Amino acid sequence: MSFYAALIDLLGRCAPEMHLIQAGKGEALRIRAILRSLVPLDDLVGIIS
Amino acid sequence: HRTLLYGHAILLRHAHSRMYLSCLTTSRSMTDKLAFDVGLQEDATGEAC
Q: Which domain of life is it from (chain B)?
């Protein structure tokens, strides 16, 4: 699980920026959507819990 | 007529339905979490088609 924690950290650091998201850059929105599809929210909530 | 070559974007229109082939965001296949269903959409807007 250190492997998966490091992978999650790498994905989070690879996630786009809030100003780009607000400006609506298509590539940034696509990257955030891809990361969203790869990692579900429920898994994060449960492993936090 | 434009000759089709690799690394080019194309648009496919169903003959009978006059709709456009696209990649839907719904995933009915529970076997794969990353899988996405492909279907028809009635609008040419966006990059999904």
A: Eukaryota
